Design an enzyme around this catalytic site. Structure first.
Site, PDB file in Angstrom:
ATOM      1  N   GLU A 173       0.868  -1.198   0.000  1.00  0.00           N
ATOM      2  CA  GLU A 173       0.000   0.000   0.000  1.00  0.00           C
ATOM      3  C   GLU A 173       0.886   1.224   0.000  1.00  0.00           C
ATOM      4  OE1 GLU A 173      -1.779  -0.043   4.516  1.00  0.00           O
ATOM      5  OE2 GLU A 173      -2.042  -2.062   3.494  1.00  0.00           O
ATOM      6  N   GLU A 292      -4.983  -7.776   4.156  1.00  0.00           N
ATOM      7  CA  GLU A 292      -4.911  -7.475   5.570  1.00  0.00           C
ATOM      8  C   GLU A 292      -6.294  -7.426   6.164  1.00  0.00           C
ATOM      9  OE1 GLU A 292      -1.416  -4.272   6.614  1.00  0.00           O
ATOM     10  OE2 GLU A 292      -3.485  -3.451   6.381  1.00  0.00           O
TER      11      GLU A 292
HETATM   12  C1  LIG Z   1      -0.904  -2.938   6.746  1.00  0.00           C
HETATM   13  C2  LIG Z   1       0.514  -3.046   6.252  1.00  0.00           C
HETATM   14  O1  LIG Z   1       0.747  -3.721   5.024  1.00  0.00           O
HETATM   15  C3  LIG Z   1       1.303  -3.556   7.433  1.00  0.00           C
HETATM   16  O2  LIG Z   1       2.683  -3.332   7.451  1.00  0.00           O
HETATM   17  C4  LIG Z   1       0.492  -3.138   8.647  1.00  0.00           C
HETATM   18  C5  LIG Z   1       0.341  -4.087   9.794  1.00  0.00           C
HETATM   19  O3  LIG Z   1      -0.288  -5.336   9.366  1.00  0.00           O
HETATM   20  C6  LIG Z   1      -0.702  -2.395   8.116  1.00  0.00           C
HETATM   21  O4  LIG Z   1      -0.551  -1.021   7.881  1.00  0.00           O
HETATM   22  S1  LIG Z   1      -0.925   0.062   8.889  1.00  0.00           S
HETATM   23  O5  LIG Z   1      -0.263   1.311   8.215  1.00  0.00           O
HETATM   24  O6  LIG Z   1      -0.360  -0.402  10.135  1.00  0.00           O
HETATM   25  O7  LIG Z   1      -2.373   0.015   9.012  1.00  0.00           O
END
Ligand SMILES: *[C@@H]1[C@H](O)[C@@H](O)[C@H](CO)[C@H]1OS(=O)(=O)O
Length: 500
Positions: A173, A292
């Site tokens: 992301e 996620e």
């Molecule tokens: C989603 C990301 O890909 C992860 O590194 C994290 C923890 O699962 C999530 O992002 S966030 O910025 O923490 O929400």
């Protein structure tokens, strides 16, 4: 008590469930790797330093696919830093989690661990600080057999046979201002397009996940997905989506309704995929990777006290309670309801970090409340998701109208001649008397009725005791082509039927 009805019709199908909806995720974050999967000092460590107790708890969940190595981490990560002799691996500042990363574990050791738990790896490439050259080189390193610099280098690093990784993530992301190497939807769509092409030219067998929005509340939500897919459609196979829930207002009735939002969210992202399909006149359908999902909120204050630049800080260590398990169950049912278009999903994350499995240094590994509905869904939820037609009593909450007390779906496994009914009763006061019309399943009987319930929605498990655990005292009974089952107030239920 209240009454609800459900028709379980063999010939009213959603789709075969892709087992990858029972996936998970290990990032280089907190104690997920160091102190989680890998703990050389530990009494249960194997020859390679992996904790055998964690291995057995992952195997019991039957997780088919694990996303790795991130996550926010991957956007600043150099994959070469984690391969080859340990003495040459540099210590890095991980800017994602403000930690020192020793690279003592890198991709080849993670592949070794994944093989012990029987999971394939959904490998991510860095599209934050890196780009298309590093993406093709990593696919070559992992998947090309021999006779090129990077394939021969993998062989020299001790891994003669290629890893043969099927499913890759194009970055993490990148839409968020807190992301390393944030990109606009156009910048990301362009680099993802060009990365996807070189990856597939190295190995045309692979499939690619392009990253959706960090969350549905982003200012760029939906616009992002449409633009990214406009740039990538011909070269990629899935679009991702992400959701976390929490009960910060201590409103159980509104909390348990949140899966209705998840349902709408999935339908929205499917719609975007099908818009861009039409705009391209493509014959290919793009599916969803829900890469996620979880409950996450309990550890937010504790995380604020962690000093920067430690090794393996205890970040994101939520301790889940019983209501959290009920919402996880509703989320799993929601994934199954969308088996036609959600083909991969990742409970974020698998060990220590917002996780169903928790560890203690030199100590036990234990099952959180949320472990149980996930285990049930993975183990008993393989087959065809049937279309539910339900008549349920309903309630209104702060944010939702007409919330059904019943959340349920049936999954038919024709090879095992089994039907599994997953059901949550959201009612905070009354049992629900569920009547299921099973006329289309002649000579089926009840096998078992599993119940997860606890009087105290805030009760947690711990290393010392597990008051929140399933029992098999559910009263489901089959009479006159009808399964009747009492669903206790605030309960998760697994009603297994089989031809006998
Ligand atoms: C989603 C990301 O890909 C992860 O590194 C994290 C923890 O699962 C999530 O992002 S966030 O910025 O923490 O929400």
């Amino acid at each position: 008590t209240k009454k609800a009805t459900m028709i379980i019709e063999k010939d009213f199908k959603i789709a075969e469930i892709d087992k990858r909806i029972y996936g998970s995720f290990i990032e280089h974050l907190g104690r997920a790797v160091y102190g989680g999967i890998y703990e050389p000092g530990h009494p249960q460590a194997d020859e390679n330093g992996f904790r055998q107790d964690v291995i057995e708890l992952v195997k019991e969940l039957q997780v088919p696919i694990i996303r790795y190595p991130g996550g926010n981490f991957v956007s600043g990560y150099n994959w070469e830093d984690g391969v080859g002799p340990k003495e040459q691996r540099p210590r890095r500042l991980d800017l994602a989690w403000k930690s020192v990363e020793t690279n003592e574990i890198g991709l080849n050791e993670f592949m070794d661990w994944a093989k012990m738990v029987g999971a394939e790896v959904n490998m991510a490439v860095n599209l934050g600080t890196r780009g298309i050259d590093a993406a093709r080189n990593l696919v070559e390193y992992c998947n090309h057999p021999s006779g090129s610099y990077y394939s021969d280098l993998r062989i020299a690093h001790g891994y003669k046979e290629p890893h043969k990784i099927k499913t890759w993530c194009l970055g993490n992301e990148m839409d968020g201002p807190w992301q390393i190497g944030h990109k606009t939807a156009v910048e990301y769509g362009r680099i993802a397009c060009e990365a996807a092409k070189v990856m597939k030219w190295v190995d045309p067998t692979i499939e690619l996940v392009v990253c959706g929005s960090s969350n549905r509340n982003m200012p760029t939500f939906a616009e992002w997905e449409a633009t990214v897919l406009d740039h990538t459609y011909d070269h990629v196979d899935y679009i991702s989506l992400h959701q976390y829930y929490g009960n910060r207002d201590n409103d159980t009735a509104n909390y348990l309704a949140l899966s209705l939002e998840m349902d709408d969210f999935i339908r929205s992202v499917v719609a975007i995929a099908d818009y861009v399909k039409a705009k391209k006149r493509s014959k290919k359908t793009i599916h969803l990777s829900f890469d996620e999902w979880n409950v996450w909120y309990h550890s937010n204050e504790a995380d604020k006290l962690i000093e920067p630049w430690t090794v393996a800080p205890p970040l994101l260590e939520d301790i889940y309670n019983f209501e959290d398990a009920l919402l996880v169950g509703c989320m799993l049912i929601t994934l199954m309801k969308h088996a036609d278009r959600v083909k991969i999903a990742c409970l974020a994350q698998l060990v220590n970090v917002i996780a169903p499995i928790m560890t203690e240094k030199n100590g036990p590994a234990w099952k959180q409340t949320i472990y149980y509905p996930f285990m049930h869904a993975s183990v008993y939820g393989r087959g065809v998701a049937l279309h539910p037609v339900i008549s349920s009593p309903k309630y209104d909450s702060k944010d939702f109208t007409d919330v059904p007390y019943l959340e349920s779906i049936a999954v038919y496994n024709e090879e095992k001649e089994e039907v599994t009914i997953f059901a949550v009763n959201r009612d905070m006061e009354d049992a629900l008397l569920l009547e299921c019309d099973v006329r289309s399943f002649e000579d089926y009987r009840v096998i078992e009725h599993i119940v997860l319930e606890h009087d105290n929605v805030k009760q947690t498990n711990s290393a010392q005791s597990s008051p929140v655990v399933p029992h098999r005292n559910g009263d489901a009974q089959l009479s006159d082509r009808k399964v009747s089952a009492t669903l206790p107030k605030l309960s998760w239920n697994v009603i297994r039927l089989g031809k006998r």
